[PDB]
Amino acid sequence: MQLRRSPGMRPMDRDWHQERARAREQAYSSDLTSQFSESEIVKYELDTAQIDGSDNPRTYIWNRTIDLFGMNGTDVRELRNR
Amino acid sequence: ASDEEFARPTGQGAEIRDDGETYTTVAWNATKLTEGSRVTDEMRDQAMV
Ligand SMILES: [Mg+2]
C-alpha cells in the first residue's frame, strides 16, 4: 500500500511538482537550511531539486536605493543582448 | 561565406557574444587561350579537302 508521502509515490503528487517549482523560485543559494523548513526539505526532497538561486527573478531584477531614470524593476534576462 | 558554428552555452542573465558570418572571395583571372593556322592560297586551291 502507498500513501501520498511514501517515497515511491512522490513523483505522482501534483504538489511535489508545484512546490519544487516554488522552492526554485524562492531561493538565493543552494543552502536549503538557510531558506526552507526542515519539513519542506524532507516532504519535497529539496536535496534532489537543482536549487541554486539561478531561477529566482529577484536575482536578475535591479533595485537601486535611488532611481531617477525608472531603471528599477527591469530584469536583465529580458534585455536586447540577452 | 565562413563555415557554420555552434551557439555558446551561456549563464542565466549573461550577455550574448558576437560571432558573425565573415566573408572572402576567390578571384578569377580569365586567361586568353589562343590557337592559329596559316595556309598558302596555292595549297588551299590544290588540296582535295
Ligand atoms: Mg566563429
Short mmCIF file of C-alpha atoms and ligand atoms in Angstrom, two decimals:
data_model
loop_
_atom_site.label_atom_id
_atom_site.label_comp_id
_atom_site.label_asym_id
_atom_site.label_seq_id
_atom_site.Cartn_x
_atom_site.Cartn_y
_atom_site.Cartn_z
CA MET A 1 0.00 0.00 0.00
CA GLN A 2 1.22 3.54 -0.82
CA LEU A 3 0.43 6.88 0.89
CA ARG A 4 0.91 10.34 -0.73
CA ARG A 5 4.09 10.93 1.36
CA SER A 6 5.51 7.43 0.53
CA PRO A 7 8.87 7.55 -1.34
CA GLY A 8 7.70 5.71 -4.48
CA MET A 9 4.63 7.98 -4.85
CA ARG A 10 6.23 11.47 -4.60
CA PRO A 11 6.57 11.91 -8.44
CA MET A 12 2.80 11.29 -8.88
CA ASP A 13 1.87 14.12 -6.48
CA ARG A 14 0.93 17.40 -8.21
CA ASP A 15 2.05 19.26 -5.08
CA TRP A 16 5.54 17.72 -5.21
CA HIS A 17 5.94 19.25 -8.69
CA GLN A 18 4.32 22.61 -7.82
CA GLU A 19 6.25 23.01 -4.54
CA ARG A 20 9.65 22.10 -6.05
CA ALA A 21 8.96 24.79 -8.69
CA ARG A 22 8.10 27.24 -5.84
CA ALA A 23 11.31 26.27 -4.00
CA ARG A 24 13.48 27.01 -7.09
CA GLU A 25 11.85 30.46 -7.49
CA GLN A 26 12.28 31.29 -3.75
CA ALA A 27 15.97 30.56 -3.26
CA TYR A 28 19.07 32.79 -3.46
CA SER A 29 21.62 29.96 -2.85
CA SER A 30 21.87 26.15 -2.65
CA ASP A 31 21.92 26.30 1.20
CA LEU A 32 18.50 24.78 1.98
CA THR A 33 18.83 25.16 5.79
CA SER A 34 19.10 28.97 5.38
CA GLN A 35 15.82 29.16 3.37
CA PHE A 36 13.40 26.21 3.89
CA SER A 37 11.65 24.48 6.79
CA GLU A 38 13.02 21.00 7.62
CA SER A 39 9.51 19.63 6.85
CA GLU A 40 9.73 21.09 3.31
CA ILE A 41 13.24 19.70 2.72
CA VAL A 42 12.01 16.16 3.54
CA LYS A 43 8.44 16.35 2.11
CA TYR A 44 9.56 17.82 -1.25
CA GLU A 45 13.04 16.18 -1.40
CA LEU A 46 14.67 19.58 -1.93
CA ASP A 47 18.16 17.96 -1.89
CA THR A 48 17.31 16.48 -5.35
CA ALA A 49 15.91 19.73 -6.85
CA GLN A 50 18.54 21.91 -8.58
CA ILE A 51 18.02 24.78 -6.08
CA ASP A 52 20.74 27.42 -6.51
CA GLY A 53 19.04 30.85 -6.88
CA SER A 54 19.51 30.91 -10.70
CA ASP A 55 15.70 30.57 -11.20
CA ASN A 56 14.68 33.33 -8.75
CA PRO A 57 13.58 36.51 -10.67
CA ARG A 58 14.95 38.72 -7.85
CA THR A 59 18.48 37.55 -8.79
CA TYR A 60 18.10 39.48 -12.08
CA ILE A 61 15.92 42.49 -11.14
CA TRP A 62 17.61 45.86 -10.49
CA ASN A 63 16.74 47.54 -7.16
CA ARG A 64 18.99 50.57 -6.52
CA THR A 65 18.38 52.84 -3.44
CA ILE A 66 17.69 55.99 -5.54
CA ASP A 67 16.20 55.81 -9.05
CA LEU A 68 15.96 58.96 -11.19
CA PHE A 69 15.54 57.08 -14.52
CA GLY A 70 13.00 54.28 -13.89
CA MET A 71 15.72 51.59 -14.11
CA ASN A 72 14.45 49.64 -11.06
CA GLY A 73 12.31 46.58 -11.77
CA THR A 74 13.97 45.84 -15.12
CA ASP A 75 15.04 42.17 -15.42
CA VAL A 76 18.46 41.72 -17.09
CA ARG A 77 17.49 38.42 -18.82
CA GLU A 78 14.88 40.45 -20.79
CA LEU A 79 17.33 42.97 -22.37
CA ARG A 80 18.09 43.11 -26.15
CA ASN A 81 21.52 41.45 -25.86
CA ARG A 82 20.42 38.56 -23.54
CA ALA B 1 30.77 32.70 -46.57
CA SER B 2 32.52 31.34 -43.47
CA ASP B 3 31.56 27.90 -42.05
CA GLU B 4 28.69 27.14 -39.69
CA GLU B 5 29.49 27.15 -35.95
CA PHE B 6 27.75 26.22 -32.65
CA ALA B 7 25.89 28.50 -30.24
CA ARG B 8 27.73 29.09 -26.91
CA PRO B 9 26.29 27.69 -23.64
CA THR B 10 25.72 30.82 -21.55
CA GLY B 11 24.88 31.65 -17.89
CA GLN B 12 21.44 33.00 -16.90
CA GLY B 13 21.35 36.81 -17.33
CA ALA B 14 24.76 36.83 -19.12
CA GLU B 15 25.06 38.83 -22.38
CA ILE B 16 25.36 37.30 -25.88
CA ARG B 17 28.83 37.26 -27.52
CA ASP B 18 29.01 38.06 -31.25
CA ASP B 19 30.35 35.66 -33.87
CA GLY B 20 29.05 36.95 -37.21
CA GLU B 21 29.31 35.47 -40.68
CA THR B 22 32.64 36.59 -42.20
CA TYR B 23 33.26 36.69 -45.96
CA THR B 24 36.07 36.34 -48.51
CA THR B 25 36.39 35.75 -52.28
CA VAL B 26 38.11 33.64 -54.85
CA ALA B 27 39.16 35.76 -57.82
CA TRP B 28 39.01 34.67 -61.44
CA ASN B 29 41.59 35.94 -63.93
CA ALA B 30 40.37 34.55 -67.25
CA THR B 31 43.46 33.84 -69.34
CA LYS B 32 43.25 34.29 -73.11
CA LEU B 33 43.77 30.89 -74.72
CA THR B 34 44.55 31.23 -78.43
CA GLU B 35 45.10 28.99 -81.45
CA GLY B 36 46.09 29.83 -85.04
CA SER B 37 46.85 28.44 -88.51
CA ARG B 38 48.05 29.74 -91.92
CA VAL B 39 47.60 28.20 -95.40
CA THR B 40 49.02 29.47 -98.72
CA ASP B 41 46.45 30.20 -101.44
CA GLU B 42 48.25 27.69 -103.72
CA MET B 43 47.80 24.96 -101.08
CA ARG B 44 44.16 25.99 -100.43
CA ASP B 45 43.49 25.61 -104.19
CA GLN B 46 45.31 22.29 -104.81
CA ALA B 47 44.17 20.32 -101.71
CA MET B 48 41.36 17.77 -102.26
CA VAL B 49 39.96 18.78 -98.82
MG MG C 1 33.28 31.94 -35.03
#
